[PDB]
Amino acid sequence: QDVNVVYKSALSLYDVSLALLVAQKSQMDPREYLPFLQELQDNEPLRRKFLIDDYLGNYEKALEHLSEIDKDGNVSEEVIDYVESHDLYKHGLALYRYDSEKQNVIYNIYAKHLSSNQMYTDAAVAYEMLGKLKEAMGAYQSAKRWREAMSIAVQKFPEEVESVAEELISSLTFEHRYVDAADIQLEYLDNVKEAVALYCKAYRYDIASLVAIKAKKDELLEEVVDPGLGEGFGIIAELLADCKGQINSQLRRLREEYLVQSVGRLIERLNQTKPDAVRVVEGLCRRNMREQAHQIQKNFVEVLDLLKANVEIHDFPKSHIVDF
Amino acid sequence: QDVNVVYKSALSLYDVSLALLVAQKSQMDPREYLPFLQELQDNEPLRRKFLIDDYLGNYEKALEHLSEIDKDGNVSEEVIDYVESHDLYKHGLALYRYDSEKQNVIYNIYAKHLSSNQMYTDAAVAYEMLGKLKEAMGAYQSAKRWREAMSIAVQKFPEEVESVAEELISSLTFEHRYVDAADIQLEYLDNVKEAVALYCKAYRYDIASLVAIKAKKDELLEEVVDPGLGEGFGIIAELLADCKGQINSQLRREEYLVQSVGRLIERLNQTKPDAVRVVEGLCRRNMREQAHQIQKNFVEVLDLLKANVKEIEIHDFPKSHIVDF
């Protein structure tokens, strides 16, 4: 004599009378309906429907009714509570679609929800539409959306600019986004030396140098770019000795399913270093260390040529300047 | 009775007498070896070897000798004309490798040659190493390498900066390189309103706004970014109508129609990241409805695409939660 389907069906037409009939004539236990149907009858229609819909598990529908109760232009602590509890932010958002002041209330609780699930970008956008900018900036930060953060920081919190910049620079650096981190050092902390050093870890010697020159700090060409070229040189040289060293050795091994996969991974690491070496070769030429330029370009073509015994490959963009 | 290999091999050892011997025993025509053997004897040993090398066609060895005729004096005009005629810039570069002064002479002729064969970058790098910065800049500009160009116009030619900047912008723009062009408007012409507009044209509303804000010209938000968000909205909106309109017809309907429906699946994936930026730009400007429609319309397509592609590799659209309802 458990609760049956006809009882539930009737309740879902919002017909308490028909649902009484059904319960009585289905031998359902009065200890499991009369109190409820009593409570149902003691409520106004809107709230009665809410309770029904809640009971039946139709939470979207429940939310709709509940939000029709208060005809003052607000969103009640009840609606807010019911939305958090049943994860109904999207529906709430759709409900209040044509009432912006109300919609904003769901937006505010959603951003909090979004934020704590580490969806920081959406949290940030939402807070920002609500004009809650300290919270938006904070979330753009955690998203590592630095342009969005600094944009709020410069316009609404200029006294926070340095702090946010420093923090963003620290996490952009850790994420190896050196060009982004350098942009901030230049433009927001007015740190030219630091910026130039960072464009160099990105192999953007072209940028680093135009920056030290536009800043009217020509000395950084020798203080910073040059040593960075030295570093880039050494980092790429040793890598090419390492590749020729592993390839010459891997041939005199296959003479082991994994040996033939290590070679294919060296091709991937190579093709990834390629854009950087091109930049190293050109930065080396433009600073007249042309023997070092020559060596880098040769050693690369060499290893690339040696991938003829490959029993796929790109060509290395030689610069004619150092091709002899 | 015909010039032969033995005579040439002997010439190649720089032995005129053994050449003479070989030539006559082999009964070659005296008119085709005597006037030439004479000229070798009429010249100095180093030039002698040069002419021999020219004749056999070994132009690399030729220059080697001809470049030893003057030492340790500088590069002769004889050596230069010989490089431009037999294209041994690379080889000239190799001989003069340990002597920087001389190598520099070969770089100057190489640069001109490069810059005549459209290779403007290598041309510029050469010119830059030679302190010929005016020439370097022009070649960087031809190569659309604007950062190298301004780096020179700022340090050595301050009067020229506004004219290169303006010229480059014009190039870059036609090349559809809107962000680059904008950077120049911003940094070198102090034209903030223009840089902002261009950033928008590249769907980079994020750079657009931060530039307006940083420049302390907030009005450009309403003045430029907003209408740009309008343009971006309508362009992507109309495009999505097309795809829905296209497919729905191409669905009903040989080898042609099926390949053009595969061209949409790439025009969409091309348009997706820009769509995102438009959706995200719209939300930040509080245009929720417009944002919502773009994201719906886009998803609508990808879903419809996900069905009928089978009945004929679709990557889903990155939604923002702000406008997913």
Q: What is the DSSP string of B106-158?
A: HHHHHHHHHTTTT-HHHHHHHHHHTT-HHHHHHHHHHTT-HHHHHHHHHHT-T
Chain A residues with a Cβ under 8 Å from any Cβ in chain B: 89-91, 93-94, 97, 103, 107, 110, 114, 119, 121-122, 125-126, 128-129, 145, 147-148, 150-151, 154-155, 187, 206-207, 209-210, 213-214, 218, 282, 285-286, 288, 290, 319-321, 323-324
The single-letter code of the amino acid at A35 is P
All residues of chain A having their beta carbon less than 8 Å from the beta carbon of residue B187 are 214
How close A240 comes to chain B (CA, Å)?
23
All residues of chain A having their beta carbon less than 8 Å from the beta carbon of residue B147 are 206-207, 210
**In 3D, which of A64, A1, A3, A65 has the Cα closest to residue A37?**
A3
Residue ranges in B190-225 assigned as alpha helix (H): 192-201, 205-214, 220
Element (H, E) at A318: none
**In 3D, which of A215, A157, A206 has the Cα closest to residue A186?**
A215
All residues of chain B having their beta carbon less than 8 Å from the beta carbon of residue A147 are 206-207, 209-210
**In 3D, which of A147, A155, A208, A151 has the Cα closest to residue A172?**
A147
* Residue indicated by tokens 């037999």: B86
Element (H, E) at B59: helix B59-66
How close A151 comes to chain B (CA, Å)?
5
Bin B190: left if φ > 0, else alpha if -120 < ψ < 50, else beta: left
First to last CA, chain B: 96
Give the C-alpha separation, B250 to B264, whole Å.
11
The single-letter code of the amino acid at A105 is V
All residues of chain A having their beta carbon less than 8 Å from the beta carbon of residue B296 are none
Give the C-alpha separation, A315 to A301, whole Å.
8
Residues 6+ apart with CB under 8 A from B170: none
Residues 6+ apart with CB under 8 A from B43: B51
Q: Which of B89, B214, B325 sits opposite A94 (nearest CB)?
A: B325
Give the C-alpha separation, B77 to B105, whole Å.
10
All residues of chain A having their beta carbon less than 8 Å from the beta carbon of residue B107 are 321
Give the rounded distance of the alpha carbon of B208 from its chain centre.
Answer: 27
Q: Which of B126, B207, B218 sits opposite A147 (nearest CB)?
A: B207
Element (H, E) at B2: none
Give the C-alpha separation, A219 to B121, whole Å.
25
What b/e sequence results for B152-173 when a residue is b if at least 16 CB atoms lie within 10 Å of its CB, and e otherwise?
Answer: bbbeeeeebbeebbeebbeebb
Does B284 contact A187 at a Cβ distance shorter than 8 Å? no
The single-letter code of the amino acid at B273 is P
What the block records as the tokens of A300 is 């690369």
Nearest-by-CA chain A residue for B107: A321
Does A122 contact B148 at a Cβ distance shorter than 8 Å? no
* Experimentally determined by: X-ray
What secondary structure, in 3-state letters, does A227-293 show?
Answer: HHHHHHHHHHHHHHHHHHHHHHHHHCCCCCCCHHHHHHHHHHHHHHHHHHHHHHHHHHHCCCCHHHH
How close B168 comes to chain A (CA, Å)?
16
| A322 neighbors A288 (Cβ within 8 angstroms) | no
How close A272 comes to chain B (CA, Å)?
22
Nearest-by-CA chain A residue for B216: A155
Other C-beta atoms lying within 10 Å of the C-beta of residue B231: 13
Resolution (Å units): 2.7
Does B320 contact A91 at a Cβ distance shorter than 8 Å? no
Nearest-by-CA chain B residue for A155: B213
| B160 neighbors B153 (Cβ within 8 angstroms) | yes
| Range A265-273 contact pairs with CB under 8 angstroms and sequence separation of 24 or more | A267/A307, A267/A312, A267/A313, A269/A239, A269/A243, A270/A243, A270/A303, A270/A304, A271/A314, A273/A236, A273/A239
Residues 6+ apart with CB under 8 A from A316: A274, A277, A278, A297, A300, A301, A304
Give the C-alpha separation, A133 to A139, whole Å.
10
Give the C-alpha separation, B29 to A305, whole Å.
48
| Range A97-106 contact pairs with CB under 8 angstroms and sequence separation of 24 or more | A97/B325, A99/A73, A101/A73, A102/A73, A102/A74, A102/A75, A103/B288, A104/A129, A104/A130, A105/A74, A105/A75, A105/A80, A106/A75
Give the C-alpha separation, A87 to A126, whole Å.
17
Residues 6+ apart with CB under 8 A from A116: none
